[PDB]
Amino acid sequence: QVIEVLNKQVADWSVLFTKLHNFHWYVKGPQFFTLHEKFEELYTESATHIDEIAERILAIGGKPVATMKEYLEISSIQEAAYGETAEGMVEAIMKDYEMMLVELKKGMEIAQNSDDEMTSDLLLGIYTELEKHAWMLRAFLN
Amino acid sequence: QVIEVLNKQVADWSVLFTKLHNFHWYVKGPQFFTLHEKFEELYTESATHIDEIAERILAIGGKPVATMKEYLEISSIQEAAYGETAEGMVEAIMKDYEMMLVELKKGMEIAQNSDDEMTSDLLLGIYTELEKHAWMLRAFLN
Amino acid sequence: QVIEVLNKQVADWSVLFTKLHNFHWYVKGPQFFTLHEKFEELYTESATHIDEIAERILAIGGKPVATMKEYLEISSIQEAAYGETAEGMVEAIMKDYEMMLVELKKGMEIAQNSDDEMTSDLLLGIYTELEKHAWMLRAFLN
Amino acid sequence: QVIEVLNKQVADWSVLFTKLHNFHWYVKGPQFFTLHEKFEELYTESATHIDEIAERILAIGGKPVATMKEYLEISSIQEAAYGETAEGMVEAIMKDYEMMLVELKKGMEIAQNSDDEMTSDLLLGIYTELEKHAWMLRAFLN
Amino acid sequence: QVIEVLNKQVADWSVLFTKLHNFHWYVKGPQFFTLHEKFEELYTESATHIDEIAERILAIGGKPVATMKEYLEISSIQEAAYGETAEGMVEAIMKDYEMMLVELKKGMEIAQNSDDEMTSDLLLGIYTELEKHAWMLRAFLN
Amino acid sequence: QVIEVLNKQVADWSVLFTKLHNFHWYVKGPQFFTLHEKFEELYTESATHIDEIAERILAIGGKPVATMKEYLEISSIQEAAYGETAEGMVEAIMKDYEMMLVELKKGMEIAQNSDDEMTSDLLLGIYTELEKHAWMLRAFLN
Amino acid sequence: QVIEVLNKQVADWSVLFTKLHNFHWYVKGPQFFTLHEKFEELYTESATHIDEIAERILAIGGKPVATMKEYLEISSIQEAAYGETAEGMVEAIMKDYEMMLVELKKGMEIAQNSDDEMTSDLLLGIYTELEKHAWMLRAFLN
Amino acid sequence: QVIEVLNKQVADWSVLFTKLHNFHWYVKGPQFFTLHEKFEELYTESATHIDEIAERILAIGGKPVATMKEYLEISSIQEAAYGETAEGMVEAIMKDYEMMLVELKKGMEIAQNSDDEMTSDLLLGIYTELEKHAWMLRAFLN
Amino acid sequence: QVIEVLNKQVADWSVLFTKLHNFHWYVKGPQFFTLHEKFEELYTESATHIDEIAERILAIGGKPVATMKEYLEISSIQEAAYGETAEGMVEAIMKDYEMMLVELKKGMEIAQNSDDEMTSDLLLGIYTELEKHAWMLRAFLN
Amino acid sequence: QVIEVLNKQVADWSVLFTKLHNFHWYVKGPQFFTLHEKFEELYTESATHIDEIAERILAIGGKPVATMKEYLEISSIQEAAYGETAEGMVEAIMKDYEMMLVELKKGMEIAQNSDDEMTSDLLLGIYTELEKHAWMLRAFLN
Amino acid sequence: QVIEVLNKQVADWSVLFTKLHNFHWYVKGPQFFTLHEKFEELYTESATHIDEIAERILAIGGKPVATMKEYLEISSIQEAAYGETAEGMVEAIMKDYEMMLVELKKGMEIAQNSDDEMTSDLLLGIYTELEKHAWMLRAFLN
Amino acid sequence: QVIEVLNKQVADWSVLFTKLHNFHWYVKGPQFFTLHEKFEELYTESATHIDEIAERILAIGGKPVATMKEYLEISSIQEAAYGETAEGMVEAIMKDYEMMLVELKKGMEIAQNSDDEMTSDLLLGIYTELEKHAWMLRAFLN
Ligand SMILES: [Fe+3]
Ligand SMILES: [Fe+3]
Ligand SMILES: [Fe+3]
Ligand SMILES: [Fe+3]
Ligand SMILES: [Fe+3]
Ligand SMILES: [Fe+3]
Ligand SMILES: [Fe+3]
Ligand SMILES: [Fe+3]
Ligand SMILES: [Fe+3]
Ligand SMILES: [Fe+3]
Ligand SMILES: [Fe+3]
Ligand SMILES: [Fe+3]
Q: Around ion ligand 9, which residues have CB less than 5 A away?
């Protein structure tokens, strides 16, 4: 179902939320201030997705996963490991975003196949959002 | 340590964050709109605590817990079981808040004993905050 | 005199101010939040009237009553009444407003008769204000 | 033509506009304030659609229907009947929204078939909007 | 009754609302932008009147007409015929406003006669509003 | 005519505008700052009246006087002899306001007699405005 | 009890509210404007305290006094005899504030003794507030 | 003296103020709205100049002219001229602005010669302002 | 590639940016103010497109053209020729927009064919934007 | 050098900053509130100058003095002896401002002579600023 | 002519606008975010200059260059070559700004010589602006 | 006395104010912009403390030190130190903050001992503030 695509999104984003807080809290170096900031911007966005998506499946008669327990057993995002570097962190969520772009494309496919371009449009937005981030994060590194 | 009091706070608040979203998403009845709203207000506040507290222990040389995994193994808050009632939900977090008031009083005790009224002050604020909520939540029911 | 009409208004509104706070503080039930709010809106309005009217008689050479003592001995609004219901409270100030509409019409009569449509206009405004409230309050009940 | 899909939207929304005012004005009960409010929110949105859609067909060389007379002979929304209940009203427009989701899907079909995903995108938005409302309205009831 | 004066106002304004949208949508010429704008300003105002008036009669125990059907059988405003001119449109609603000034004066008469200067005051405001418009609209032409 | 009452208002206010600037510029003493300010507040208000009134007579088919020349030959306000005192200035415009209250009452009389309570309402507002000022100005002195 | 300390605060502040309005209305002299203003600032603050405190005792299971009648029989603030001086008024509430500082210190003592530094913190704030005012009020005089 | 240059500015601007109101009030045609607006923008600007300049000479020990009487006997700006065209009006103040540019250049000359580039700078600003207007006004015509 | 579609957009928009400034600067007539304004609105929008598009191709691994030199050798928009009329200018960019709608449709085709509805969505937006403008610009003329 | 003129400005303003705080803190009398305020306004302005000037010399390759030590050995402003009068304070900084006008004129001379009208322009602004203050301060006294 | 100085400014700024976008888009490294931002700030400012200057010459009877074609054949700014470094870019526009300071000084010379300190003042501002930037840009490097 | 603790705070903060400006002005490197900014944020905060503390001792009958002269002879903060590194500066005030935490703890001790938890609370706030900064500053380095 599409509800499953969405529910995995919920789980993933929920993980990102915490993971971004971690990086928000543990980042260090001459890029502290700028990165401390960026991550808060990112988890704020993550929180937005969590509610929209949930309310989306909620709008299509689905039941959104709503326990960290479930999130953990369904999310494919690997939580923080600590000790990460400032660059490590940027590198880390950047990969996370990219690995999510694929799951999204797949998600729009099935959404469209289940005659639900509405949900597809929602997903398309997130896709556009992350793609821009990936570029800036990448440019920060490369 | 005080860091432990704070880190349990972080874990508890993190759980509340998700639990409040759950109620935000699953609430029903003629109190929908007003309760759908209130819960969002509450998880927004919860998110504030998560960062202040974390950054507090972070300011006192501690290392904030930052994985849902840890949160789950340390929080004392019961993750939402489904199918609750609108009143059930209100009743539910109301109890959660009250059970937290006690842990807070204890938390200020030790904070003060460890010569740290700063952290105690932080905790005192949350206490005041929840007490008001408990009253309003309670008055909503009783 | 017109000053007497106005001074009774002052007294009445002053009582309403406190009475609305009481209801603001003691209301209970599933209408808590919405009614807790409405009453604050109402006593805020009441406070507005208290100053305009006072400053009105003050603008027409009068001397505004300014002690709770006098208010009590001149206001015709009940007050107190502790164990009141949420509906009881709505029902209560709704009647208070209606009983004030009459005193207002009378007040505009004498204001006009004393060649003071200015004060009449001021009173007319309050009249319009209360009439709308009465309707909403009433619709809330009926 | 697509212009016809849009023009029916215009008519429908125009009806909703008035119908929502009716409910805005005639609603009663302990849900007054909250529902009095919600309906105004809804007719404000309806008014938005009326202008966008009109200006859309206007942008694609069409001529928007612009008389209540025509609206009445083309809209499929059944105007108010009075006597409705607070729940009745919520139940009423909720059904109206759902019956409009179908007409929209159909509308996007033909839009796409006439090589106009632009108009389809416009319609898709309204679809998403109503779907969320339907859920909240529904949750209010069920 | 006064309720009848008001209800005709509601009907008239409701018609103006649509008629102003029509002109908003169909206007053309070097005065497009400025007139496209002005009409939107005007139908926004019209919508304000619709609700105030309705809520007025609603505040005086009346029942506001709330169907386009009734509006059509009671309004005295001519629904826009198409093909008008930019000047034609300005000329058109300008006359509409003037024809309304008379009905208003009459309306205040009866309002006053029925001991209701409140409603008269409401009507007086609209009068003042339209008179200014008529002048500007007129000056635009003459 | 009523146009004559209004046109005298225009002239008077126009004079006040300049006279208030004079006091704004020439005031001195320990009340400088507070009075320097108050006068600017007053001439700003004066400017408001000049336009409303003008546009009022303009709305009732009249032709507003629009030359300082005419203003001078029709206004009854005493231009500012120079060298006044801070108290003198306050005392000065206070008298001007009071002398205008009378002309206003007269103005509303004729407005009403000419079946124009609209203009009367406009004038009524100014009356209310000045009466308050007079009190504050007076209290400043007495 | 602490509830009694708070309830006396409520009563005192309620009296201050009216007493400050009195001074707001009856003040005179070259300090009119500045003092007319200051008092309004003060009674606005007073109103804030009335609600916080009430809602505080309300949060700790207490029942806030809510009738002017009770206020009068419990407040220790001297209602305003009439005819005071501008300086008299400043001198008057300044003393009132100082006499309240003592009751507050006492209030924090018992709050702390009853293991309620929360309420103590609330009271501490008011203390800080008044102390600053006292200085400015004093400096205004001395 | 420089005070004389400035005082003529004051007088001129004062005249412009009224003259712009006249045009604001008597303009007509298809350019009504846009010109009705522009003139108000212009007299608002004029009022700004009147106070800055006055306060400028006031800052350099001068005494600003402050009576319409003096303004009339010193200003070089025409005034009156009733039956003027929309274009006539634009053409009219445009010439007024240009004739002021010359007086300004002269004014900066003497200001500089009297070792007062401060006043010169002030004047320079107005110059720049008017030059832009002249262009737009001109482009409106040509 | 899609990058080529986007890069031509960049070039085109960059040209429009300058061309719109030209019209912004050289426009004349009784439509000056309104058209002077509109063009600034348009080049502001153009600038928006330039950055979004660039950053879009930048997000899809492309390299955005970034020299006026390249813009000139790739854009299909014909720069201004001066001497244009107010109507000429409106007529001019109106055609430019329409000629761009076609290039856009083509652009979405290839975007979709290269499995990139993201970019297609971006382009779709611009399409909708221009279509509305074309209508208003057209209505201004016809 | 010009850097020396600027650096003396920095020192002077730095002294003013503290001196204005002193007056802000020690002022007394019936002018307390208004003067308490004015001084804060002034030291806020002073702080602005300190940074602009510093950053100015910083922009012209200079090195801004940045220690209170240096400020003291170079500033020509008389630190505040204690116990001044309210009028004394006003009189005090007023003289300080005037004594600075001269140093500024001199400063613009050398700035211009060193082919740096940029810095001169900066200084010119401060000059204009202080001149206005001097007048108001003076008018407050005289 | 002065028009020529200004028109070269227009051309130069126009080039800077694009060149700054280039750097905005192609910058990379740990300074990405901060520099990506700064450049946008800079091209925003550049765009401001383009219009002010153009409108300046437009105000002095000149005809502003308005084609990228002309810009290219008259600007002295080197269009970005690709592959620069983050530092390279900063170094690059920093030099551009400095090379512009000289052309500006020359520009004010001739402006002054042609009796046009107005335009000189305009140019002086830009000078001040760039000088500050150069310092910050420089400090970023050195 | 407590006044002495506070007065040292005043002196210290006053020094910090200047010292932070120095760093604000002399910082260099790839961290320029971000550090140039941070320091301004810090001295703005410092200025806040200077006034609160002063006004605090002022509220407790004390007399705040108010001359740079005294500041210098009582502050324990270094100052000067010209050729400092970007990191050096961060390292520098970070140590300053930490050395202030100790003086603050001591300060709260004596405040509490002198029965003044009010002042203690004020100090507690600053403590919390600095502790957070120290962490961020530290994380920036380590
Ligand atoms: Fe939500
Ligand atoms: Fe944070
Ligand atoms: Fe008041
Ligand atoms: Fe529209
Ligand atoms: Fe309504
Ligand atoms: Fe006007
Ligand atoms: Fe409350
Ligand atoms: Fe002024
Ligand atoms: Fe960008
Ligand atoms: Fe700075
Ligand atoms: Fe422009
Ligand atoms: Fe202060």
A: I 51
- Give the single-character DSSP code of K80: P
CB atoms near residue J73 (< 10 Å): 10
Residue A97: partners with Cβ closer than 8 Å, 6 or more residues away: A130, A133, A134, A137
Q: After which residues is chain H broken (C to N over 2.5 A)?
A: none
D101: how many CB neighbours lie within 10 A of its CB? 15
Interface touch I25/K71, C-beta < 8 Å: no
Instruction: Show me where chain C is broken: residue before each gap, C-N > 2.5 A.
Output: none
Solved using? X-ray
Longest dimension (CA), chain H: 49
Tokens read off for K65: 């260059």
Beta-carbon contacts of H118 under 8 Å, excluding residues fewer than 6 positions away, are: H60, H111, J124, J127, J128, J131
Domain ranges of chain D: 1-142
Residue recorded with tokens 């007539």? I29
Nearest to B35, CA basis, from B129, B127, B140: B140
Q: Which of helix, strand or coil describes residue E64?
A: coil
Chains D and C touch (3+ CB pairs under 8 A): yes
Q: Which two tokens stand for residue B2?
A: 């005080």
Secondary structure element (H or E) that encloses residue G96, with its range: helix G86-113
CA of H48 to the centre of ligand 8 (A): 9
Evaluate whether D7 touches D74 at the Cβ level (below 8 Å).
yes
Tokens of E16: 């103006």
DSSP symbols for H26-87 = H--STTHHHHHHHHHHHHHHHHHHHHHHHHHHHHTT------HHHHHHH-------TT--HH
Q: Are J80 and J23 in contact (CB under 8 A)?
A: yes
Contact predicate K103/K126, CB 8 Å: no
Ligand closest to E23 (CA) is 4
Q: Ligand 2 center to residue A36 CA distance, Å?
A: 8
- Could you tell me which chains touch chain A, where touching means 3 or more CB pairs under 8 A? B, D, I, K, L
Of B22, B24, B68, nearest to A15 by CB-CB distance is B68
Q: Which CATH superfamily is domain K1-142 in?
A: Ferritin, core subunit, four-helix bundle (1.20.1260.10)
Is H116 within any annotated ligand binding site? no
Q: Distance between CA E97 and CA E131 in Å, rounded?
A: 8
Phi, psi of H74 (to 5 degrees): -120, -30
Residue G131 tokens, joined? 């102390």
Which residues have CB under 8 Å from C83's CB, separation 6+? none
Question: Quick check: L131 and B58 CB within 8 A?
Answer: no
For D67, the 3-state DSSP assignment is coil
- Say how many C-beta atoms besides its own lie within 10 A of residue D38's C-beta: 23
How many angstroms is it from I47 CA to the middle of ligand 9?
10
CA–CA dist J87, J85 (Å, integer): 5
Q: Cβ C136–D36 below 8 Å, yes or no?
A: yes
Q: Do I140 and E27 touch (CB under 8 A)?
A: no
Query: Resolution in A, one decimal?
Result: 2.5
- Kindly report the CA angle at C116 between C110 and C120, in degrees rounded to 5? 70
**Which residues are CB-neighbours of C78 under 8 A, at least 6 positions away?**
C19, C92, C96
Cα dihedral: A103, A104, A105, A111 (round 10): 110
Q: Tell me how far apart the alpha carbons of residues C79 and G64 are, in angstroms, rounded to a whole number.
A: 15
Subunits close to G (at least 3 CB pairs below 8 A): B, C, F, J, L
Question: How close, in Å, is residue I24 to chain K by CA atoms?
Answer: 9
Task: Quickly count: other Cβ atoms within 10 Å of residue D78's Cβ.
Answer: 12
CA distance L61 to C37: 42
Residue (of H120, C55, K108) closest to G22 by Cα position: C55
- State how far the Cα of J44 lies from the Cα of C125, in Å rounded to an integer: 44
Q: Do chains F and L touch (3 or more CB pairs under 8 A)?
A: no
